[PDB]
Design a protein around this ligand. Sequence first.
Ligand SMILES: COC(=O)C1(NC(=O)N[C@]2(C)CC[C@]3(C)CC[C@]4(C)C5=CC=C6C(=CC(=O)C(O)=C6C)[C@]5(C)CC[C@@]4(C)[C@@H]3C2)COC1
Ligand SMILES: COC(=O)C1(NC(=O)N[C@]2(C)CC[C@]3(C)CC[C@]4(C)C5=CC=C6C(=CC(=O)C(O)=C6C)[C@]5(C)CC[C@@]4(C)[C@@H]3C2)COC1
Lengths: 172, 172
Amino acid sequence: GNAKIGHPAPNFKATAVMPDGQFKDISLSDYKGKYVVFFFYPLDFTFVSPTEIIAFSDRAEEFKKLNCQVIGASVDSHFSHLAWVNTPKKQGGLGPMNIPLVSDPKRTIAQDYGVLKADEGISFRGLFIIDDKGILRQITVNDLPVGRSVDETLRLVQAFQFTDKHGEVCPA
Amino acid sequence: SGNAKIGHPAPNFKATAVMPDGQFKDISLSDYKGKYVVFFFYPLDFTFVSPTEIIAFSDRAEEFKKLNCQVIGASVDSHFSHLAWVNTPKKQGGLGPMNIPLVSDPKRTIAQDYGVLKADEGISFRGLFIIDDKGILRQITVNDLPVGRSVDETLRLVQAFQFTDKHGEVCP
Ligand SMILES: COC(=O)C1(NC(=O)N[C@]2(C)CC[C@]3(C)CC[C@]4(C)C5=CC=C6C(=CC(=O)C(O)=C6C)[C@]5(C)CC[C@@]4(C)[C@@H]3C2)COC1
Ligand SMILES: COC(=O)C1(NC(=O)N[C@]2(C)CC[C@]3(C)CC[C@]4(C)C5=CC=C6C(=CC(=O)C(O)=C6C)[C@]5(C)CC[C@@]4(C)[C@@H]3C2)COC1
């Protein structure tokens, strides 16, 4: 892919299902000025992914406190994303979301981020931390069966922000 | 770039390491087939963040031993530099005695193979790789230079890969 630490994270423009349940075309560059956690999950209607998606959504306030936008993405269609959002949580659905979920049906965003499982046309569990200038700071990629930690993601975002100010601080 | 791909054999290496007994030995990643491996890079010796990571992994080596998991650190520094850092007491800003080997990558080819060489500086990013007992790469972590890694998170991941291996074997 083209995701390189210290270089601008690859831009994308893609249809997402938004927290209000409607579809909107969004770009990574829309979020310049905020930190971004951009994470891929393989497919809708799966069993490791909902734990991750619901945790990032449930804890979106903690990322807001860090001026950090969270965005999920999968190769499944935005229609499929919304079907999973609208599925009752009691039956395995996501329920209402506090984060947008991007659709990557052409697989080009996953390829740009180096996380396409090429023999299977779905993304690995890639997670990318992008700073407020659009520069990639952190790459995380898990094989399909192993999920990610919101605690660890928050630790990383906060630590990048703190070290960002190392040298900018009042010298009293 | 690099050749580290999830689900493919992790790039082999053969390099001089400082072993836990304080002596030089040439080792290869393939020496550790049959064990999980946590293989991690740090930018250079005699720094500020890197020793806290290395000492944490060394101090907690027994927790990885209980998971049948070998931990190996690496940087582009010479093997003499590694040994000098080990021979410097923790009291005085060194590593002190180590429970893990420290690989020397002076030709930068291991860092290049793992896609973590920060070109134009000749040092590696904070790359961490989880390799299963068959030598297959399962997890990629790369941090920009200022932010360190978590041993807790690394153990969570190793445990989770071993957990899912119990039903995710390709062969019964
Ligand atoms: C960019 O514009 C500006 O900064 C303006 N000031 C300005 O240039 N000051 C100058 C001349 C330039 C900048 C520096 C060299 C650097 C920061 C500075 C040491 C410093 C840092 C940290 C504080 C401080 C005092 C507090 O009471 C405090 O709460 C905080 C948190 C002080 C101790 C006040 C002086 C200070 C601001 C000087 C002084 C121009 O109109 C505002
Ligand atoms: C498949 O080959 C065979 O079973 C033959 N038996 C054979 O080698 N038995 C022996 C000698 C004894 C049985 C064991 C110890 C156990 C299973 C085994 C590790 C293993 C398990 C799971 C696969 C495997 C390779 C694949 O390509 C695959 O799709 C699947 C799903 C392999 C990795 C091939 C070797 C394997 C079969 C060995 C090898 C009959 O022709 C050879």
